[PDB]
Amino acid sequence: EQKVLVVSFDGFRWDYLYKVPTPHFHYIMKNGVHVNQVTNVFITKAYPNHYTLVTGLFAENHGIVANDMFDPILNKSFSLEHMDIYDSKFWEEATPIWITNQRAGHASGAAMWPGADVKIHDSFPTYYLPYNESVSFEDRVAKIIEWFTAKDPINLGFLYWEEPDDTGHDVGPDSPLMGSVISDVDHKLGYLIKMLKRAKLWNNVNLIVTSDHGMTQCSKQRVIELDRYLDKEHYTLIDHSPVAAILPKEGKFDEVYDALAGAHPNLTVYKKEEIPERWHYKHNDRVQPIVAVADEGWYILQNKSDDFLLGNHGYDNALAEMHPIFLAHGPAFRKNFTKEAMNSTDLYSLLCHLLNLTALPHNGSFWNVQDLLS
């Protein structure tokens, strides 16, 4: 019976491995697999990308299209910043893998993974923690290890940590201060490895270490200010930057579109049905009528006092800076092997294969990632 632990270090851009010594990441690489370029999903934010990892679906299919959404059929909002994510209907266009695992008779465990503390199709992971950012990494690891060794043990665990995303936002990925947080995340990975070894799990758990997206440098010299073009009374801004999800008030669609389209060289304004197919974003009623996408490193501010951060993400998923790390170690994985590319939609197919689960309909392909396996 194979076991899998998926770890997400939020916002761990693929090339952060090289910013400072990362001996514990390199230990997994030498004894495991590493994928250089993981194409994640648009928009390149936490909630769409973590749900893709556990469904194998693009965002237009699994329905978690952003961290901040408005569903016009439900007439309900979803907002990560307000901790307003627990309305089950926002999640139920798909089924995450822990439910499929449990329907097959296994137990799953989740330590702060996005959505794992949400009731979905009347179900939770067998074991989970109510989301609380203040819980230490070491306490999250302790629960995971406890669950893998419990009287009724899990075969599938999910572990989430908010760095290096948090600091990346604050200082920007180009800051020399990033080295400190990357070194700390490497140290935390080392702690996890040590605890897996102490619990006699290191050589019988397949450890997969990845992330939701990367990070790019922003600047107060690279700002698009919407109120230079648009009357704030004539639309609602559902999501702000770098993918502005715009709901014009009744009658104002042409006004808003004509004022904003072509108004700034680094803001590309799409009507919903003209959104690029390659983003697999548009076929969902939670995609707003106008979606305005800032170019890499540009910030959208509704007005002068809107939020600004020196690092951000959410940009085009073709951009290298938006791509996350991916590496893994375990009995099912090759050793000292490097692969050039994968799609993050493929992880679900890999998980279902490792766990001997029947995958639900998805957008990835096991055949794309079979060469990672021993």
Ligand X SMILES: *[C@@H]1O[C@H](CO[C@@H]2O[C@@H](C)[C@@H](O)[C@@H](O)[C@@H]2O)[C@@H](O[C@@H]2O[C@H](CO)[C@@H](O[C@@H]3O[C@H](CO)[C@@H](O)[C@H](O[C@H]4O[C@H](CO)[C@@H](O)[C@H](O)[C@@H]4O)[C@@H]3O)[C@H](O)[C@H]2NC(C)=O)[C@H](O)[C@H]1NC(C)=O
Ligand Y SMILES: Nc1ncnc2c1ncn2[C@@H]1O[C@H](COP(=O)(O)O)[C@@H](O)[C@H]1O
Ligand Z SMILES: *[C@@H]1O[C@H](CO)[C@@H](O[C@@H]2O[C@H](CO)[C@@H](O[C@@H]3O[C@H](CO[C@H]4O[C@H](CO)[C@@H](O)[C@H](O)[C@@H]4O)[C@@H](O)[C@H](O[C@H]4O[C@H](CO)[C@@H](O)[C@H](O)[C@@H]4O)[C@@H]3O)[C@H](O)[C@H]2NC(C)=O)[C@H](O)[C@H]1NC(C)=O
Ligand U SMILES: *[C@@H]1O[C@H](CO)[C@@H](O)[C@H](O)[C@H]1NC(C)=O
Give contact residues for ligand Z (rule: CB under 6 A).
265-266, 295-297
Using CA of residue 242, residue 279, residue 217, residue 8, what is the dihedral sign?
A: positive
Q: Which is nearer to ligand X, 89 or 198 (CB)?
A: 89
Return d(Cα 52, Cα 215) in angstroms, integer: 19
Point out which span in 75-83, 198-206, 298-306, 354-362 binds ligand X (CB under 6 A).
75-83
Q: Which is nearer to ligand Y, 139 or 166 (CB)?
A: 166
Binding flags for ligand Y, 4-43, as an x/- string (CB under 6 A): ------xx--------------------------------
Point out which span in 20-28, 206-214, 282-290, 345-353 binds Zn ion (CB under 5 A).
206-214
Q: Which is nearer to ligand U, 97 or 182 (CB)?
A: 97
Give min distance, CB of 305 to ligand Z, in A.
24
State yes or no: residue 304 binds ligand X (CB under 6 A): no
Closest CA to 54 of 1, 105, 11, 118: 118
Identify the residue among 54, 85, 185, 293 touching ligand Y (CB under 6 A): 85
Identify the residue among 162, 170, 184, 225 touching Zn ion (CB under 5 A): 162
**Vertex 7 angle, CA 130 and 144, to 5°:** 55
Give min distance, CB of 15 to ligand U, in A.
18
State yes or no: residue 76 binds ligand X (CB under 6 A): yes
Q: Which is nearer to ligand Y, 250 or 340 (CB)?
A: 250
User: Interface residues for ligand U in 53-82 (CB under 6 A)?
Assistant: 57-58, 61
Q: Which is nearer to ligand Y, 18 or 86 (CB)?
A: 86
State yes or no: residue 133 binds ligand Y (CB under 6 A): yes
Return d(Cα 34, Cα 40) in angstroms, integer: 15
Token duo for residue 31: 């004894």
Specify whether the CB–CB gap between 357 and 370 falls below 8 A: no
**Which neighbouring-strand residues pair with 161?**
9
Specify whether the CB–CB gap between 140 and 159 falls below 8 A: yes
Give min distance, CB of 57 to ligand Y, in A.
18
Q: Which is nearer to ligand Y, 55 or 155 (CB)?
A: 55
Query: CB-hemisphere CA count at 13 Å for 36?
Result: 5
**Residue 144 one-letter amino acid:** I
State yes or no: residue 46 binds Zn ion (CB under 5 A): yes
Give min distance, CB of 362 to ligand U, in A.
6
Specify whether the CB–CB gap between 235 and 183 falls below 8 A: no
Q: Indicate the Cα dihedral angle 129, 132, 136, 139, nearest 10°.
A: -10
Point out which span in 18-26, 52-60, 158-166, 278-286 binds ligand Y (CB under 6 A).
158-166
Identify the residue among 280, 286, 313, 323 touching ligand U (CB under 6 A): 280
Query: CB-hemisphere CA count at 13 Å for 171?
Result: 16
If you write DSSP's letter for every residue of 41-83 in order, what string do you get?
A: -SS-SHHHHHHHHTT---HHHHS---SEEEETTTTEEEETTTT
Helix (H, G, I), strand (E, B) or coil at 123: strand
What number of helices (H) and strands (E) belong to the chain? 10, 18
Binding site for ligand X (CB under 6 A): 75-77
Binding site for ligand U (CB under 6 A): 57-58, 61, 132, 134, 280, 303-305, 341-343, 346, 361-363, 368
